[PDB]
Design a protein around this ligand. Structure first.
Ligand SMILES: COc1ccc(S(=O)(=O)N2CCc3ccc([C@@H](NC(=O)c4cccc5c4-c4ccccc4C5=O)C(=O)O)cc3C2)cc1
Ligand SMILES: [Cl-]
Ligand SMILES: [Cl-]
Ligand SMILES: [Cl-]
Length: 291
């Protein structure tokens, strides 16, 4: 269990960013690691087999605004990025989840197109294949996996921001709606802790949110927990050693550098570190420290 870092890839501040930086909760340190080959905001991160993957996003720069179909793989042992097979379609404001060593890419936008499509990557074959689409088009969608089921939470369908959520059952290649959240959320941080899916922050169409709610997959209810100290949309999120970490985002005024940590036993959030610069729209995941 020792030696794991929280990696943050990409993001946005004035333009899309190429940063890869890693935080060590055990000593408070940050490391700046190899830049992404292509800057991207609105991407997702995940880990399979000790390797960090950056999926989708958009490169917003002074010279263009290009949605990404890319999958790139970072090896901590070499501090190098390598390209992998690209997805069927560009997906900005994507969500991803991992089931049994496979990466699921969910939703996202391509220009004015709001995807319901979903595709699955096989690392051993370096291949993507489309699976059943969601029941709803969703960009800015939060995705997480619990008990080998994939959840897609909130987002924006092209007309309305959403409180709805749905679950993918892989053995039936089928999506079904679940109970909707209490709050409309696009750009929330979504993760899994114990037997619940958490949705933290986001934008409800009017304001960035500090509220946090969790879906108990047995009882099918959403319950609010303690709110974050900061309102935040387009935040990064991960779980590490039984606590939720939220990174950056936008509070309606500032691109935040603060990182907050949720302790479920006390139902409290605390500020634990600051990123090296404020940013939103990052991808976050946990893996071993680099060489
Ligand atoms: C070209 O400029 C960019 C700026 C930031 C980014 S991003 O990577 O951070 N990101 C991608 C993922 C994602 C998902 C949901 C939302 C939700 N919006 C908001 O909270 C929102 C609403 C009103 C005004 C603003 C924002 C916002 C949010 C963040 C930064 C600045 C602002 C801002 O001023 C929503 O639309 O639901 C926003 C994003 C934004 C990308 C491009
Ligand atoms: Cl699978
Ligand atoms: Cl298979
Ligand atoms: Cl595989």
């Amino acid at each position: 269990k020792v030696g794991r870092l929280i990696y943050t890839a990409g993001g946005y501040f004035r333009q899309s960013l190429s940063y890869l930086e890693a935080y060590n909760p055990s000593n408070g340190s940050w490391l700046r690691l190899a830049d992404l080959q292509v800057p991207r905001s609105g991407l997702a991160g995940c880990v399979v087999g000790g390797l960090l993957y950056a999926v989708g996003g958009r490169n917003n720069s002074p010279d263009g605004n290009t949605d990404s179909s890319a999958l790139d793989c970072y090896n901590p042992m070499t501090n190098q990025w390598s390209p992998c097979a690209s997805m069927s379609v560009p997906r900005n404001r994507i969500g991803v989840g991992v089931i049994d060593g496979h990466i699921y890419a969910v939703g996202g936008s391509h220009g004015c197109i709001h995807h319901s499509s979903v595709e699955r990557y096989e690392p051993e074959r370096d291949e993507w294949h489309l699976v059943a689409p969601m029941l709803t088009r969703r960009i800015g969608v939060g995705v997480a996996v619990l008990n080998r089921l994939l959840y897609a939470v909130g987002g924006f369908d092209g007309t309305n921001r959403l409180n709805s959520a749905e679950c993918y059952y892989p053995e039936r290649n089928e999506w079904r709606m679940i109970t909707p959240m209490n709050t409309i959320r696009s750009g929330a941080g979504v993760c899994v802790l114990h037997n619940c899916i958490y949705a933290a922050g986001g934008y409800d169409g009017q304001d960035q949110l500090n509220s946090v709610e969790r879906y108990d997959v047995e009882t099918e209810t959403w319950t609010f927990v303690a709110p974050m100290r900061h309102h935040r949309s387009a935040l990064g999120i991960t779980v590490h050693q039984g606590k939720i970490y939220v990174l950056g985002g936008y509070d309606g005024h500032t691109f935040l550098d603060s990182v907050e940590c949720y302790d479920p036993d006390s139902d409290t959030w605390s500020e634990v570190t600051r990123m090296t610069s404020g940013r939103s729209g990052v991808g976050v995941a946990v893996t071993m420290e680099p060489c």
